[PDB]
Amino acid sequence: AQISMRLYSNRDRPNHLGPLALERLARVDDVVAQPARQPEDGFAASEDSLLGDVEEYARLFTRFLDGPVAPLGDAIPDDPARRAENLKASAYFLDASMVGICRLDPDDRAGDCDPSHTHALVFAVQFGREPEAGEAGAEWIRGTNAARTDMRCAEIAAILSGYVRWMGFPARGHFSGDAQVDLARLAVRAGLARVVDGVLVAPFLRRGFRLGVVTTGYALAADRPLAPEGDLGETAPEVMLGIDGTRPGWEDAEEEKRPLHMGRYPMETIRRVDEPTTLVVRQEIQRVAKRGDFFKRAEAGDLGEKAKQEKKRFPMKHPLALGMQPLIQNMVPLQGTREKLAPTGKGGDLSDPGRNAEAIKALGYYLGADFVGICRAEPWMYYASDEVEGKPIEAYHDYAVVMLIDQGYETMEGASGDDWISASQSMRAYMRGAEIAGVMAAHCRRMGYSARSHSNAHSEVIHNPAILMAGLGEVSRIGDTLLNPFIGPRSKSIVFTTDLPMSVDRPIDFGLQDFCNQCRKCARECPCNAISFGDKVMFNGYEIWKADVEKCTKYRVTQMKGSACGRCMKMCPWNREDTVEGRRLAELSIKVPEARAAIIAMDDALQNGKRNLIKRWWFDLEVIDGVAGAPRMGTNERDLSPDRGDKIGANQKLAMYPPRLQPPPGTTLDAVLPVDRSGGLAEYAAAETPAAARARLKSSA
Ligand code: B12
Numbered sequence: 006a007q008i009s010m011r012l013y014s015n016r017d018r019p020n021h022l023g024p025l026a027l028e029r030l031a032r033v034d035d036v037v038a039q040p041a042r043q044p045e046d047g048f049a050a051s052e053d054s055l056l057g058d059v060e061e062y063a064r065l066f067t068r069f070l071d072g073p074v075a076p077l078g079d080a081i082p083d084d085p086a087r088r089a090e091n092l093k094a095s096a097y098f099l100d101a102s103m104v105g106i107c108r109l110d111p112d113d114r115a116g117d118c119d120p121s122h123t124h125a126l127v128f129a130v131q132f133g134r135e136p137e138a139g140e141a142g143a144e145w146i147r148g149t150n151a152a153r154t155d156m157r158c159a160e161i162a163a164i165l166s167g168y169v170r171w172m173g174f175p176a177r178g179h180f181s182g183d184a185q186v187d188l189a190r191l192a193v194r195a196g197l198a199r200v201v202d203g204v205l206v207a208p209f210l211r212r213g214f215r216l217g218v219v220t221t222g223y224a225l226a227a228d229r230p231l232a233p234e235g236d237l238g239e240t241a242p243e244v245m246l247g248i249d250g251t252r253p254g255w256e257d258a259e260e261e262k263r264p265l266h267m268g269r270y271p272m273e274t275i276r277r278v279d280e281p282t283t284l285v286v287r288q289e290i291q292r293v294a295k296r297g298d299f300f301k302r303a304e305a306g307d308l309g310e311k312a313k314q315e316k317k318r319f320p321m322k323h324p325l326a327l328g329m330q331p332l333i334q335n336m337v338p339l340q341g342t343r344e345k346l347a348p349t350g351k352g353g354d355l356s357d358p359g360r361n362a363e364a365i366k367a368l369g370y371y372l373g374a375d376f377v378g379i380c381r382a383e384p385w386m387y388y389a390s391d392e393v394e395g396k397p398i399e400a401y402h403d404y405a406v407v408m409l410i411d412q413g414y415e416t417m418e419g420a421s422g423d424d425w426i427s428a429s430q431s432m433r434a435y436m437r438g439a440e441i442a443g444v445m446a447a448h449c450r451r452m453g454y455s456a457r458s459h460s461n462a463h464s465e466v467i468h469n470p471a472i473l474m475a476g477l478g479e480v481s482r483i484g485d486t487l488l489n490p491f492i493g494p495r496s497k498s499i500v501f502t503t504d505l506p507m508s509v510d511r512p513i514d515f516g517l518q519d520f521c522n523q524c525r526k527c528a529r530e531c532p533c534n535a536i537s538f539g540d541k542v543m544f545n546g547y548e549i550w551k552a553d554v555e556k557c558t559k560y561r562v563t564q565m566k567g568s569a570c571g572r573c574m575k576m577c578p579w580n581r582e583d584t585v586e587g588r589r590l591a592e593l594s595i596k597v598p599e600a601r602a603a604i605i606a607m608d609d610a611l612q613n614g615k616r617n618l619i620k621r622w623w624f625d626l627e628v629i630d631g632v633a634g635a636p637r638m639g640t641n642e643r644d645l646s647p648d649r650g651d652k653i654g655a656n657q658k659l660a661m662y663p664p665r666l667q668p669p670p671g672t673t674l675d676a677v678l679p680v681d682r683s684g685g686l687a688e689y690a691a692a693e694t695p696a697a698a699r700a701r702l703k704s705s706a
Pocket residue numbers: 285293297298299300431461464466467468469470472473478480483484485486487488494496497498499535536545547548549552553554555557558561570571572573574662663664
C-alpha cells in the first residue's frame with residue numbers, strides 16, 4: 006500500500022552528490038546576476054504560532070556563525086575537489102536539501118565580509134510540510150515556515166563554519182537573520198536556483214526553501230549555474246525513476262497524501278498491544294540516581310583514571326563534532342520549566358486530547374522528527390536525584406513526548422561503527438533532537454502548559470522506557486537500545502515532558518522477541534563483547550537483555566582508533582536501506598516467522614555490514630591539544646567477524662549494575678564509588694529468569 010520508497014539502491018552513489026539528481030540538470034559556466042529574494046510564507050503567523058520560538062533558536066545559533074580559528078595542522082587535504090566533496094557531504098549529513106559551491110568576487114567582499122574569503126558553500130533547506138486546513142495544529146504552524154527553515158539554515162551554517170574553523174581556516178556562516186553577503190545572488194551563481202519574477206526557484210524544492218552560506222578562504226572546487234532558460238531536465242526518465250538511487254519524482258506527491266501527523270513511515274500498520282512484549286513490573290522498579298549513569302561514573306572516577314581523563318573528550322575528537330558542541334551546550338539553558346503553569350488561552354482549542362496528540366505529532370514532523378510518539382511520564386521514568394547537588398528529582402510532568410532522529414544509514418554504511426565519524430553521528434542526532442524538542446516545549450509553555458526537554462547534555466528522565474511505552478520500539482538484544490521496525494536500532498531519541506493533555510500511544514509488537522532470540526549478530530560484532538549472547542534476565546523489575554555497561558563504557562570513552570562507538574547499530578539486520586527490497590525484508594521479518602532464521606543467515610551470507618568504501622566521505626582527523634591532525638593510533642576498519650561458536654551463551658559472563666550496585670540516590674560527582682565488578686558478575690548469575698518472575702507474580706494474582 007506504501008509505494009513512495011525507492012526502487013534503486015544508492016549504494017554506488019557518493020554522499021557529496023546528495024539525494025537529488027542535481028548532476029542531471031542543464032548547466033552553463035556563467036549567468037548574468039539579477040535581483041532576487043528568497044521564498045516566503047503565503048500567510049502571516051498569529052500569536053498562537055510557533056514563530057517566537059524558532060526565532061529564538063535562530064538567534065541562539067547566530068552567536069556561532071563566527072568563532073575562534075584553530076591552528077592549522079599538517080593533515081588537511083590540499084585538493085580542492087576533495088575538499089569540495091567533503092564539505093558538500095557534510096552539509097547533506099546535516100540534512101541540507103541541496104548544496105553548491107561558488108567563488109566570491111570583489112563586490113561580495115566589499116561589504117562587512119572578511120576580505121580573505123574567496124569561496125562560498127551555499128545550501129538550501131526545503132520548507133516543511135504543513136498541516137492542511139482544519140487539521141490539528143494548523144494554527145500553530147501556518148506562516149512560520151521561513152523562520153522555521155531559517156532556523157535550520159543558521160544551525161547548519163554555524164556547524165559547518167565551525168567545522169572549517171577547527172580545521173584551521175577562517176570561515177563565517179550566513180543566513181537571512183545575519184548575513185554579510187548576498188544570499189540570493191550566491192544561490193544563483195552556485196547553481197541551486199534561478200529567478201522567476203524576482204523570486205528564487207530551485208529545481209525539486211517545490212515547497213519553497215531558505216538559504217545558508219559559509220564563506221571561507223578554504224579553497225574549494227566550484228559548481229556551475231543552472232541553464233537560465235527552459236527545461237532543466239527535472240522530469241527526464243532517469244530522474245523520475247531515480248535510477249542512480251535518488252529521490253523518485255513521484256515521492257513528493259505520494260507523501261503529501263498522508264496526513265502530516267502520521268509521519269513518513271507506516272507505523273499505523275504495526276500491531277499495538279496494551280502492555281509491552283517484555284515483562285514490566287512497575288511496583289518493583291527502583292528509581293536510579295543520575296550519578297549512576299555510567300558516563301557520570303566515569304567522570305567521577307568510578308571506572309579508573311583513563312576513563313576519567315577521557316570523559317569530556319571522547320565524543321569531541323573530530324572537528325565536525327566540535328562544530329556542533331557550542332550549539333548543544335548552549336541549548337541547555339533553554340530546556341524549560343519544571344513548575345506548573347496556568348493556561349494562557351493561546352494555541353486554539355486544546356480541549357480534545359486526541360487532537361492535541363495529532364497537533365504535537367504534526368509539529369514534530371514539521372520540525373524534522375523521524376518518529377513521534379506520546380506516553381504517560383510515569384514516576385519511575387524520572388531519575389531519583391541529580392548528580393551535581395544530589396537533590397531529589399520530582400515527577401513534575403504528566404506526559405512524555407518521545408521523538409526519534411535517524412542517525413543516518415548511508416554514513417554508517419561507509420563506517421566501521423567505532424571510527425572517526427561515530428560520535429559525529431551521535432551528536433548530529435542529539436543536536437537536531439534538542440533543537441526540535443526545545444522549540445516544541447517552548448510552544449507548550451506559550452500555551453500555558455509546563456514543558457521541559459531532556460537532552461544528551463541534560464535529562465531528568467531515562468529515555469528507554471518512554472520509547473517502549475510510546476510504541477516506538479521493542480526491547481532488543483543490543484540491550485540499552487530499543488529497535489524500531491522501520492529504522493532498526495539506528496536512532497537517537499529526544500524526550501520532552503509536558504502537562505499538555507494528549508491521548509497516549511500504545512506499545513508495539515512486531516515479532517522482535519522471537520527474531521532477536523534467533524540472531525546474535527550485534528553480540529558477535531561488538532568490539533568488547535559487551536552484548537549478551539544469552540537469554541533475557543530480570544533487571545530492576547523488568548525483563549531485558551542486559552549488556553555489560555562497564556565494558557561498553559570503557560570501550561567508547563577510551564578506545565583510540567576512533568571517536569566512541571555504535572557498531573551494534575550498524576551490524577543489525579534491521580539496519581537497512583530505504584528501498585523496496587529493504588522494506589520487504591522487514592515486512593517479511595514482521596509477518597512471516599518461518600522466514601526469520603533465513604533472513605538472519607542471509608544477512609551474513611550476503612555480507613551485510615561490510616564497509617562500503619564509496620560512502621566514506623569524512624576525513625580521519627583527531628584534534629589533540631587544540632589542533633586537528635592525523636589519528637595518533639590509527640583507525641578502526643572492522644569487517645564481519647566469525648562465529649564465537651555454539652556454547653558462548655552458556656560461557657559468557659557479564660556484569661550487571663542494578664540499583665544495589667549503583668551510587669545511591671543523593672550521591673554526587675564529588676564522591677567516588679569504584680565499580681564493583683566481581684559483585685556485578687555475581688549479580689548477573691543470580692538474576693531471576695523472566696519465566697520464574699511470571700510464575701512468582703501469578704501466585705499473587
Ligand atoms: C549513560 C548512557 C550510555 C552508557 C551507560 C548506560 C548505563 N546503563 O549506565 C553506555 C556507554 C553503556 C551507552 C551505550 C550506548 N548507548 Co547510551 N545512553 C546513556 C544515557 C545518556 C543515560 C542512561 C542511564 O541513565 N543509565 C543509568 C541507569 C538508568 O541504567 P540502567 O539502570 O542500566 O537502565 C538502562 C536500561 O535498562 C534502560 N531502562 C531503564 N529503565 C527501564 C525500563 C524498561 C521497561 C526498559 C525496557 C528499559 C529500561 O535504560 C537505561 C539505558 O542506559 C541514555 C539517555 C537517557 N537519558 O536515557 C543513553 C541511551 C540509552 N543510549 C543510546 C544509544 C543509542 C547508545 C549506543 C548504541 C551508543 C551510540 N553510538 O549511540 C550504545 C548502546 C549500548 C548497548 N549495548 O545498548 C540511546 C538509545 C536509543 C534507543 N533507540 O533505544 C539513548 C536513549 C540516548 C538517546 N537519547 O538516544 N550509553
